[PDB]
Structure formats: C-alpha cells, structure tokens
Design a protein that fits this description.
Two copies of one chain form a homodimer. Chain A contains 33 helices and 25 strands. The first copy, chain A, has two domains: 1-456 and 784-807, 3-Layer(aba) Sandwich (Rossmann fold); 457-783, Glycogen Phosphorylase B (Rossmann fold, 3-Layer(aba) Sandwich), CATH 3.40.50. Bound molecules: ligand F85 (2 copies), inosinic acid (2 copies) and pyridoxal-5'-phosphate (2 copies). It is classed as transferase.
C-alpha cells in the first residue's frame, strides 16, 4: 500500500504464504477449520521469526571471528512492547506480509493486536533500554542487553469505581515465539554463606546456589542484516519431607517471578536485592567466558564495556572485583584499574527517595564478601579524598559510600561514581544539576568523569511503526534515508509554506484522531468529539509530574464554562493516562480525582461536547503507539529540576503534537532546537524554584490572591466532586495547602494563561500546522541513534557503522 | 540393517536429512559447528514429530465426523518412558532415520539415550496405563488418556553409602518436543466454598478457582495411521501486598507440581486429594463438551465410557452426579442410571493399607457438595442391601461407604462398586480373591458386576523396541504379523527341535548380555562375568514382593561356597533393582541390606567370579528395556495372594528368560500357558497361606529346624554384613522373627531347592534354550492387545479394528 513498508514481490508473497500454512499445520497443530485469530497471529509470528534466524546466527559468528569490543548494557528493566510489527519494519517485510495475509483472507492489523506487550519495565528508564537496543543494532555495535525474564511484568491496570486495581500480567500464558531457551548455558549464582580467610586470600563458602537459565531474544537492526541478542535470566532451583522439599523449589525460582512496580520510593526489600545480584552474577560469568574465548586481564577494558542503567546493577562493581581478586588472583590495584575502565554509570533522577541506599545488615547476611569489598573500596577512595582536600572532614563524611545513622546504609550512587570511568546524566540541565548539587563533591575530585548524554527515542517504533501515514508523506518529499538519519528532517523546513504539505500534515493528524476515537468506542465504549483539541498527558502517576496541575486547569475550564455558558470556547478532549505504583497512596488518589472530575464534567448538559475528561486505562507501550500519533497537545509540566529528561516529550514532538511545558529535562533542548516561539513554555525555571525554597513556599498566599484557585479548592473540600463522600479528597487538599514539595499553586496562573495561548492558535488551523511542521523538522537531535553514537564515541571507545552485513 | 525396522528408501532418507537440517537451523537456532549431541537429538525428535501431525489431525477429525463411542481412561499415573524410538517403530521410520542419521555422521542409538523418561508413574499401575494407550490406538478405538502433567515425576534414585537418596526428576528442563500446550482450552476447577439450597436445588458457592490447562501428547497406533491423544492437565492460577499476592500464585500451581511416590501406604494428604479432584473435574467438563457437540443424556452411556484406573479418580462418580443433577437439572434416579452405565472400576490390590479411605473432615472442607452426594448414594445403596438381605445388620455396616470409628472415612472402593456397571481384577486368581474375600458382600448383591481382565504388555515396546535381535529371528521364521497378533508366536513350537533356531535364540541372549555388561562398566564402573546366569529381580521395593527372600538365597549361596570353596557351582550374577517409597523405612533398610551383601560378596577372593551381587540404581522404564532382554532368570516371588497380577513377569517371558515364582497373580496363568514343566514353581499356594494364618505363623519354628537359615540370621544379628555398625539390621531381624506378614521363612526351603533345579538346567544350554522357546511361544495371551479387546467387548461395548486409516 505505502512505499516505506517495502516491496511486495510475487516470489516473497508466495513463499510467506506457504510457510504460514506450514507453521499452522506442523507448529500449531491446527487446520483452517478450527483455527482462531490467535492461531493465525502465531503462524505469522513464526513465519517472520524464521527470517531472523539466518541473520542472527551469522551476526553472532561474525562477532566471534572479528572479535570487536563488546558492549554490555545491564538493566533490571527492558520495556519492549510488541515485537511482530517492529521485526517486519526492520526486515522490510511489512508490505509482503500484508499482501500474503490479505491473499489468505486475513487482516494483518487485527492479528497484530493479539500479541501481548513484553512489559518488562516501569516507564522511561525501561523504555530507554529498549530504544537503545534498537539503535545499537542499527549502528552495527556488538551489543548485548542483559536482564531478568520476569514471569510477570508490569501489572495490568483495571479501573473499578474510579480506583486503580492491579492484576497479574501473565504475558507468557500463550507462549513467547520470539525467545529461545538456552538451558545448556545455565550458570550458578551464590547467596548467603560466609567468608573464610586462608593463606591464599579470601574464600566465599557455605553458600546456597540458585541457577540462572538464559533466554535469548533477537534484536534486529534497521535493514542492515544485523541481529543482536537480548539475554534474560530465569531463576531455577538445583536438583539436589520429600514432597515439601520439591515444593520449596519455588522459593529459589521466585527471584525471577515479578517486576517490582515501585518507581517512586526506594524500599530495601530482600527479594529485590536478590534480583539485582542474580542478574549481575550470571551476566559477569558470561562476559568473562566470552572474553577468555578470544589469562591477561590488561586487555579486558579494550574488549569489554559495561553500562549500568541506574544503580540497579551497581553490584557489578564489587562482583567484578570479587572475581578478579578472589578467583583470578589479580592484585587489588590492577583489578581496580580494570574495573574502573570497564564500568560506566547513568543516573536518571535527583529525587533523594528514588536513590538506592541498601541497609548494611541485608548485605552482611546475603552477600558477606561483597560488603567486605565495598568497605575496602570506601577506605581507599576516602584516602584519595583526604589527600586531595586535607583537613576537610565534612567532605569525607559526605562522600563516604557508607552512610551512618539509625541504620547504616551503602549509597549505591557513590559506589557507582567511585567504580566508573564515566558518569552521565540524561539531559543537559540534568547533568548540570548533578555537578552543582548532589554529586558536587565527586565532580570537584574527578571532573573528567562527568558527562551528558541527552536521551532519545528510536524513530523506527516511534514514527515508522506507529505513524506510517506521517512517515509516508515525509518520504514523498525527502526520501527514506531520514529513518536511520533523523537529522535529515531539517529539510522539511523548506516546506513550511508549501500548501500541499500543510494540508497533508493536517490530514494525517485528522486520520490518526478518527482512528483513535474509533478505538475508544470499540474497546471501552467511550464517545469523543474528533474535532476537539486532543490534550494528552500520558506517563506514570507521580507528584513531581504534576498531573494535579493538569486537573486544576481542567476544573478551571469547567468553571469558566458554567459561569459563561453561551460564550465560545475551543472544544477539548483532555486525556490523562498512566499507572500508579501499588503502594503510592497519593498517586492512587490522583487517579480517583481524574475519574471523579470526568464523572461530573462528562455528564453536564450545559458543557455539551465542548469539554471531555477521559482517563486512559492500562497505559503501556502498545497504547502509547496509538494515542501519541493522535495527540494535538503534549503535556510536559513537571516542576523545573525534577524530570531528569523525559522521553514521552520526544515521542509527541516527532508525531505532530505541540508541547506545553516547563523548562525541565529535555524540554529545554527541544525548545532550543525548534525555537522558543514554536513552543508553549511557562512557569518557574530551576532558579525561581531555588529562590522560592530559600524564602519558604507558602501555598496559602496563592489561595488568598487567586479567586479562581480558591473556588477549586473549596469545590474539592466541600464534596462537589464526591457527593456521597464529601471528605474523599481531604488528603489532596491538605497536601496542596500545607506540604506540596512540587509547588503546584506557584505555576497555576502562568499555566492557565499559557493554555489560553494554545487555544488561540488552535483556532487558526493553518498556523497551528505550520508550527507543527517546525517541530517535526527539528526533532532530529532526539533520535536514540544520535544518543548511542555519543555513548559509543565518548564512553565505550567504539565506532558506529551503517554498513550492511551480507544477507 | 534388520527387516522389522522398515524400509530405508532413497526418497525418504533424502527428505529426513533435509528436515533434520531445517530443524537444527530454524527450530534450535544452531549451526553444525556448535551443536551438541543433545541438539542433534532434538533435531531428530522434531523431524519424527512432523510425521505424526498429519495423522494426528486426521484421526481426531475422523472421530468428529463418524462420532463413535469414546473411551476415557482416567489415571493419576502414566508411566510413558521415552517416546522417540516408540514413535519410529509405530510409524515404520526406524531404518530410514537410522540411515539418514548415519549419512549425517551420527549414531542414532547415542541420540536415543539423551531423551528423558516421562516418569509420570510409580510402577505397574502407571505402566499398565501406558501399555493400554498403545494397544487402544493399535486396535483403532476412539480412546483418550486423561491425567496430570506433573512437573516432577518419580524421583531419580541415587545410592550413597548403600542408602537410597532421592532427587527431583526435572524431566522438563530441556523441554518436551512431544507435547502441545493448549492454553486456549483451559477450564476452571472449584475448591472449598459451601452449599446453598434454593427453590431449584443445591448450589455450590464461594469457591476458590484453579485453572486446568491441557497439554496434548500424540499416541500412535502400530502402522495403522491412527494417532490418539493423551491429555494431561497443568494447574494455573487465575489472574485476579501486591508482590506477595503474585508470589502466592504458587499455592494453586502446586497441584500439578509432583507425583506422590508412596505406593505402599495410603496417607490422607490434602494436596493429593486436590490432585485427584483436579484431574476428575477438568476431564468431565471435556467429556460433556465433546458429548454436547455430537440436551438428552439418555444416550450419554452409548457415547461415553469412563474407566477408573484404581480408586484414584473415584471422584468421577459423585462429580458426574453433581453435574447432571445440579447443573443439567436431571432427576436423581435418571442421573444415577447414566452414571452407573458410564463408569467402570479396576482394582489393583487386596492389601488393606493400599486402599483409599478419605477422612470425612477433609471432604467436608474441600468438597462439601461431593460429600452430600456420597451420603445420598450411601443411603440409597444401603436401602437396596436391606431389601435384599432383610435383618442382616452387620452386612449393612460392612457394605457402607461410610466407615465409623475414631475418624469417619469414606471407602472409595465401596463408592466405585456402587457407582460402576463393571468391576474387574487384573488376573484370574486376583479376581477370584476379590469375590471370596474383600468384595464378597458386593458380589452376593450384584454378581453380574464382577469380571476378570488379566493384564498384558505391549509387544511393540517390550519386544520390537527393546529386543530387535529376537524380533528379527522370530520374523525370519513366521513373518511380521505377530507384532499386532501375538498369539501367532505359538507357531514357534514347531521350531523347538530346530538346531538353527536353538542356536539363534541362544545367540540373541548372549549378545543382549554382552551389551548390558558393557553398559554397566561404561555408566557405573561395575564389572560382571557375561557367562554367568543373569538372575534378575526388578520392581518397586515392597515387603510383599519379598526381595528379602532373594537376599536370603544369595547369602545361602555365599555360605555354601565358603564352606566348600573347591566345589563347582554355576556362576551367577544376581541383580536386584527398584525404588523405595521415601517414607517406607523397611524398604529403605532392604536396599541397604542388598548393597551390604554386595560389599562382602563382591570382594571375597575365594568367591571369585562365581557370585556377584549388584543393586541396579534408578530402575525406570528405559532401564527395564535394557536389563529385561539380558535376563536368564526372572524372580517373581511374592507371597501367594498378594501380587494382584504383576506385569514385569510378562516382559521377562516375552524376552527369553525362564521364571522362578510362586503361584501368585498372573504367574498362575503364565505357567498354565507354558506348561508347569516349563516353569520353576515353588512355595505355598493361597490355600497354604490361609491354613498357616489359622494356625498362627511362628517364624521361630523355621529358625529352629533349618540350620542354614539360623546361620544367616546369626550373621545378620552379629554384624557380619555391617562390621562398623553391628546392630544395623536389627529392625530386619526383628521383623522376620516376630512380625512378618509375608512369611519369608515359610517359603525358604522350597525356594532354595527350586533354585538348585534352575542351576542344574542352566548346566545344559541346549535344554535351557528349548525351555525358553516353549515360554516365548506361549506368551501370546499376555499381549495388552488381548487385554484391551476384552475390555472393549465385555465392558465398553465397542468393537476393535485392525483396519488402516488413509495416510
Ligand atoms: C529505585 C526504585 C525506587 C526501585 C526505582 C525503580 C525504577 C524507577 C524508574 O522507572 N525510573 C525512571 O523511569 N526514570 C526515568 O528515566 C528516563 C530515562 O532516562 C528519564 O527520561 C526520566 O526523566 C526518568 O524519571 C525509579 C526508581
Ligand atoms: C493409594 C496409594 C498408597 C497412594 C497407592 C498409589 C499407587 C500404587 C501403585 O503404584 N500400585 C500398583 O502399581 N499396583 C500394581 O498394578 C499392576 C497393574 O495392574 C499389577 O500388575 C500389580 O500386581 C499391582 O501391585 C499403590 C498404592
Ligand atoms: O568455539 C566456537 N567455535 C566456533 N564458533 C563458536 C565457538 N564459540 C562461539 N561460536 C559462535 O558464536 C556464537 C555463540 O556466541 P556466544 O555464546 O555469545 O559466546 C555461536 O552461534 C557460534 O557460531
Ligand atoms: O466445530 C467443529 N468444526 C469442525 N471440526 C471440528 C469442530 N470441533 C472439533 N473439530 C475437529 O475435532 C478436533 C478437536 O477435537 P476435540 O477438541 O477433542 O473435541 C479438531 O482437530 C477438529 O478437526
Ligand atoms: C515513553 C514512555 C514512558 C516515558 O514517558 P515520560 O513522559 O518521559 O515519563 C512511560 N511509559 C511508556 C509506556 C512509554 O512509552
Ligand atoms: C513393568 C514395570 C514395573 C512393574 O513390575 P512388577 O514386577 O510387575 O512389579 C515397575 N516398574 C517399571 C519401570 C516397569 O517397567
């Protein structure tokens, strides 16, 4: 149908059709008479998977022969989503599979909806790992993603009576055609035990063993025949009254059972610590095995890079030391030199409650040798600080890896900085804040260590796959090369006054909105006006992300309508979606508030179709691919200095939405690229937040001076949005009035005013679309290909390559 | 190589080779350079599996079209063993696969050894179900095997310091290529809750739900293109703080985790009760669904037969009533008529400790509605007894399904007789004992209900597969038809004086013994003399099976050698193998005794190679296929009246061993078929055991009157067989002297004398072999094809058919 989806050649279509039928018969053991749409999905999945295999085997043997430096990306999260369409796109099979399935009497889009998301992540950090895997394969790097194969990923979110309900994400129920179990490569991981000192060093003895079984998933590059590996570990009990002993195997296998869904507050839970060590210990054995199959560990950093995605795999640092010192018998200083040159650490937040600080007593019991190594790292590190800053005793206590107090803790971020040659933030403003605030002491000691690597998203999934209509109209003008070189989108600026292109951009958006409006009715029975402004905020529910500020605007619009009903206002569909961490009470209250506002707003006859408030249930990668192409306005309204980067912001920019946002995270660089005149910027900057903190933030002041804000707070308190439980939202009101860390009231006035400027522009479709074109055209910097190329050159010491491998 | 293994045509060999390579590449994701023998096994398994699929789909659709009466064989055990060779044999692919693999540079026999046994059973009862599945497919019956997919089958047995150690049988670790998961056909099973009475009958409410997910395994008939289904249920939790709730899913899924390995003593364990209901509830929903896809349940018994393998699935009876009465709204009397005509029950033991008697309080909590139904069945049944035998109050308490006492129990055997139209024993003597002793009252009420169905074994696995050499020399003389018509073996009697045939039979046995002698050295480092008499007792360790009597003979031979060292004795290799139930202390002591005897006997220089005692570790189906073809003497020495049938006895007879045994179980019919002169019969008959019980069994009498027996007991007591723990075997001595239920001493003298007659004949190879020929020639009755044909005609009301389906 469309050009960017590849060729539908007679020979390939014929071939796909027969392999589809072969799988339906031999693989699924079904005939056409009893086959369901799910059976047809699996037959297609296996057919497409066949095309990966040859390339997968030859890529991996190519690495064995040529022995390039290997990149190991360690993460507890890989938020992969669906694999079928992505595979077709990267292999140039989409039009051929569409044609083949059409000829068999099937709709491929319907078959695509059957696949479960691989939801092995919480949000941005997990999705970043997924985009990075795609870019690393596309750039021809010898890269491996290492993580945990959770049996249950992020919970499915049900909304019952306006409240979030969690249910198990049983994503493996019908099987996973993409993975290959490798039980032959199972490795032992040790826990507990004790440390024995002998003539020849320390020995870790009397341990309990858990087996780590790898499952490999192919990661195809974009049309370069490169297929890399994501290896995820599954926990297995070793084979050595009777009935109970067998049933107790579950205890060991619980390690890989479920993803921890708390993304707001660090809890030192033992099972989580086991998960973190499990991935680290199994992965490092793999790394060393592969290195030895190339005695001398001087070349180790020349052949290995380990990237730590946050501090979650930080135990890699003392584990590498343990292996080099205890097992390989290297002296401490040499082992440390190797470790530092091998490891690099990425930080994703400055919020203190989201930083890992493990109680010493847990590490003492679970990993006694690792604690000894950490103490030794700390002593040697603090000797360097003391020599650099003589007599500065407070610096010594501030920089210590060991935190004293009620309970002693290890600061995993401090461990990571000490043991890494590079530390990066994820957007320019974020990396600056790190140097000026929480890691200031470390920056003063080792300035060379600190870098910025602004985040990005893959334009394969986040344009070509989810928005083929926009990809096509772009390709008509400038060709197809931009898909792996997103900077080429700048060429679109010469079409900003092109009447045909303006109309096409606006047409693609309208089609996306109609399609999403139809999805909503079919799947959830909710009716929206497709001519309204699609006002979208989708992301995990957090106080810092300020879904509450959005809520206040929505109520303001409602109250204004009720005051002057016969006055014209630009119609809006306000959509808010995202999951809340199960133990995050305030986030769960915010979801309830959103639905409660909807219950009042959506049923007021005076409002009509001029304002609709919808909570988007079960927000996940597959839903993002649907809603983002349909959005007109992207809400990126975190308190300045709190959102390290954001990546959803970039997805919306690439897909033709305009952005309303604070000068926070990557928003700053986005506005810089597009021009501030083409962005809806409002609110306090970081410096204004700082000035307000020094003075003391008093929410009462805003309540007293803004009548419209007062009315909303009174409405909340009095039970206007909860008639049968008048005090339902008292926690929210109390927080806003007395202990709001994120200064919602302080940005209210400027936010509302900025929103009026948005409505004013939307009234002029031609100028709206021209501003959209200016955004899409300057979104090139935010490709994860750019991000990964910078990691490769500036941290890993390897050169990217767009050169194709033989098919 | 050999004729019975089929054709190796140029076209088939070429085809198998390329499909092997396709699976290695696309299915296993491996290249020849890194592939291991295990990879090669899996590639072959998938290639052979492909040939099943077409026939599997067409067999099942044929049943849907023709709608024949369906046979449902319900068992908690299916002792399947390995599947690869059996599949090749039944599909006539063995020579072709041998040739194809040879041309690829691989040894197929080596690849065969890689496959794990499906050890989903304990012993004879579980293996009977497996043989029955093979025969039902071979006889063209629309038969389904229904059971539980245990994650862990019968434990692997390790011997450490002479003691049995158990370890988990992780048979699914590398995957199972034979099964197909059918998650789309998952069904709910209910537990706990309470019973609510309404206007329209009872309702079972407030239950906990566990999901039953089916896995289907193909069961190919012998060269008839029939492929039936074995459906095994796996337990799954339904999808509806957070972390713990997810981890607690294990509780539900534990139902299908492990096979209970106690085959000696009934323990009323709750998890076992859950297993029994789980298989029954899921299976019956399947049966009813399939029946409704043919309102009127009058035709139900015309379209459905349910065979209960022991009382383990006895809950089928009240569950069928529950469904018909509570859900389908049939009146009680009609539902009962249907139930009785549908169900049949097979008994496998008369030993009271092995009979299921479930505590009322467990059933009350777990299955409250089923208990109500059982009580109602009992009241109506006892009203019939009272009308038939007026005033016989003791009969009423004897026949009750409810047993009064300290704890009230349900007698599941009584439930089965009441609710079945047919009750059978498993050998003629066994079925007679049932009528005369434990089920006498029931036989007097309903004589028509009671039948015999003498057990059998499949000649595919137990001759063609495990003993191809013997199968071939038989086929040379009489052709190949005997493989599915074992009675044709009678034609071999005209070759009893044929000098060529005598030599060939003796040659095949010698080759089998050399091969097994080599297996022992290679896998266990034990050295045996292949010219000795192979004296074999393999079966589960039980007091009734009297491995202890064998032990006493072995010590007698040793003591006789030590007394007269320079006297000639026929050299023997005495092999004893079998697992003991983990909680069966006496059985574990018996294993220790066997190894302890070996430790003394095998290292005495005076003995030389004249006597060797070996414990065969980890006895299982795959080991039986190796040792049975190598045996000269089959030990079948249970106390008369205790072994219901035996099936191992039949395996040895088919494979050219002579039998030493008591007149117990099927031994009686075996001796009848072969002629008593061609059997080594010794010991008390059932009547002699009865006379001894009435008198009172006093072991001291035998000790006092037999000097050779006294010496052995003194040796045991004094620590001759345990120098470092002199009192190690005190439990065994005490049992033998004071509380031996199985009268080991009473059969000692006749056993030893009979063993001398065996040695005398072995000294004359020609006459030994002629007696062997007489046994093989008359083993035809003991084919499970004969057994199943009798079930089909006399119980199920269906006609067998050797007619081939189109390929
Ligand atoms: C330590 C613990 C509380 C368990 C925890 C666990 C997970 C998270 C988590 O999911 N954390 C994020 O997604 N972090 C996100 O990372 C992306 C990518 O750089 C950024 O764009 C975004 O600004 C940042 O908030 C945060 C905290
Ligand atoms: C009730 C419980 C104690 C759990 C239990 C569980 C399993 C068994 C068990 O495995 N039981 C047998 O194998 N029984 C065997 O069945 C075969 C086939 O008919 C006969 O040849 C043989 O004589 C008989 O002992 C016996 C008892
Ligand atoms: O020892 C070897 N000989 C030949 N190829 C090898 C060897 N080891 C690894 N490979 C290749 O590398 C791949 C496996 O890589 P690895 O398991 O990640 O180390 C396989 O697909 C092989 O093609
Ligand atoms: O409704 C039907 N239409 C056509 N074939 C059916 C239907 N139901 C069952 N079958 C056939 O019967 C087989 C499944 O049988 P069942 O699941 O055991 O009842 C399938 O392989 C089909 O070929
Ligand atoms: C991109 C993405 C995120 C991250 O969004 P932010 O607005 O940057 O927090 C979270 N969840 C999903 C499913 C995503 O795709
Ligand atoms: C045949 C068989 C049995 C049954 O043997 P008996 O001597 O009849 O008890 C037990 N286990 C296995 C593995 C068998 O093959």
């Amino acid at each position: 149908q469309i050009s960017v989806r590849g060729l539908a050649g007679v020979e390939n279509v014929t071939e796909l059709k027969k392999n589809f039928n072969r799988h339906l018969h031999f693989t699924l053991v079904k005939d056409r008479n009893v086959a369901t749409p799910r059976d047809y999905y699996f037959a297609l999945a296996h057919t497409v998977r066949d095309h990966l295999v040859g390339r997968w085997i030859r890529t991996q043997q190519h690495y064995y022969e040529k022995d390039p430096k290997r990149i190991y990306y360690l993460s507890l999260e890989f938020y992969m989503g669906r694999t079928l369409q992505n595979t077709m796109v990267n292999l140039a099979l989409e039009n051929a599979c569409d044609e083949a399935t059409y000829q068999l009497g099937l709709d491929m889009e319907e078959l695509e909806e059957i696949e479960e998301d691989a939801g092995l992540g919480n949000g941005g950090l997990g999705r970043l790992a997924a985009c990075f895997l795609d870019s690393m394969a596309t750039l021809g790097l010898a890269a491996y993603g290492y993580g945990i194969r959770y049996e249950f990923g992020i919970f499915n979110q049900k909304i019952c009576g306006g409240w979030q309900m969690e249910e198990a994400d049983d994503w493996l129920r019908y099987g996973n055609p993409w993975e290959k179990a490798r039980p032959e490569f199972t490795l032992p991981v040790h826990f507990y035990g004790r440390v024995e000192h002998t003539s020849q060093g320390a020995k870790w003895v009397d341990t309990q063993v858990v087996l780590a079984m790898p499952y490999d998933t192919p990661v195809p590059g974009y049309r370069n025949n490169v297929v890399n590996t994501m290896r995820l570990w599954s926990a297995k009990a070793p084979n050595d009254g009777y009935i109970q002993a067998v049933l107790d195997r579950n205890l060991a296998e619980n390690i890989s059972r479920v993803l921890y869904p708390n993304d707001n507050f660090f809890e030192g839970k033992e099972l989580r610590l086991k998960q973190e060590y499990f991935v680290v210990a199994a992965t490092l054995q793999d790394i060393i095995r592969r290195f030895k199959s190339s005695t001398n560990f001087d070349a180790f950093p020349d052949k290995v890079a380990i990237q730590l995605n946050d501090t979650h795999p930080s135990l890699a640092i003392p584990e590498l030391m343990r292996v080099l010192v205890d097992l390989e018998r290297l002296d401490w200083d040499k082992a440390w030199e190797v470790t530092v040159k091998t490891c690099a650490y990425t930080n994703h937040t400055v919020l203190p409650e989201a930083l890992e600080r493990w109680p010493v007593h847990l590490l003492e019991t679970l990993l006694p040798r690792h604690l000894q190594i950490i103490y030794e790292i700390n002593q040697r590190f603090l000797n360097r600080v003391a020599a650099a800053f003589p007599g500065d005793v407070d610096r010594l206590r501030r920089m210590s890896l060991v935190e004293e107090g009620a309970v002693k803790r290890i600061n995993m971020a401090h461990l990571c900085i000490a043991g890494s040659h590079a530390v990066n933030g994820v957007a320019r403003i974020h990396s600056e804040i790190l140097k000026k605030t929480i890691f200031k002491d470390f920056y003063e000691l080792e300035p060379h260590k600190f870098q910025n690597k602004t985040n990005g998203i893959t334009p394969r999934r986040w344009l070509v796959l989810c928005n083929p209509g926009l990809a096509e109209i772009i390709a008509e003008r400038i060709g197809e090369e931009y898909i792996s070189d997103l900077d080429q989108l700048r060429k679109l600026l010469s079409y900003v006054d092109d009447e045909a292109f303006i109309r096409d951009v606006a047409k693609v958006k309208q089609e996306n909105k109609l399609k999403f409006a139809a999805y909503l009715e079919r799947e959830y029975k909710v009716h929206i006006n497709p001519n309204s402004l699609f006002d979208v905020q989708v992301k995990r529910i957090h106080e810092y992300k300020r879904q509450l500020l959005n809520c206040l605007h929505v109520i303001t619009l409602y109250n204004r309508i009720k005051k002057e009903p016969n006055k014209f206002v630009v119609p809006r569909t306000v959509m808010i979606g995202g999951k809340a961490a199960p133990g995050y009470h305030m986030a769960k209250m915010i979801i309830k508030l959103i639905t409660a506002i909807g219950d009042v707003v959506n049923h007021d006859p005076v409002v009509g179709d001029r304002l609709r408030v919808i909570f988007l249930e079960n927000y996940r990668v597959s839903l993002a691919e649907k809603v983002i192409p349909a959005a007109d306005l992207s809400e990126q309204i975190s308190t300045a200095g709190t959102e390290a980067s954001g990546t959803g912001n970039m997805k919306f920019m690439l897909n033709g939405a305009l952005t309303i946002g604070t000068m926070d995270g990557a928003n700053v660089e986005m506005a810089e690229e597009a021009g501030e005149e083409n962005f809806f910027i409002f609110g306090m900057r970081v410096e204004d937040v700082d000035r307000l903190d020094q003075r003391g933030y008093n929410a009462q002041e805003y309540y007293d001076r803004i009548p419209e804000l007062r009315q909303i707070i009174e409405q909340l308190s009095s039970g206007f949005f909860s008639p049968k439980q008048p005090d339902l939202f008292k926690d929210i009101v109390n927080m806003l009035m007395h202990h709001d860390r994120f200064k919602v009231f302080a940005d209210y006035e400027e936010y509302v005013k900025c929103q009026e400027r948005v409505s004013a522009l939307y009234k002029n479709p031609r100028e709206w679309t021209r501003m959209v074109i200016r955004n899409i055209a300057t979104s090139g910097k935010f490709s994860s290909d750019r991000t990964i190329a910078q990691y490769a050159r500036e941290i890993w010491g390897v050169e990217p390559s767009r050169q194709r491998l033989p098919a």
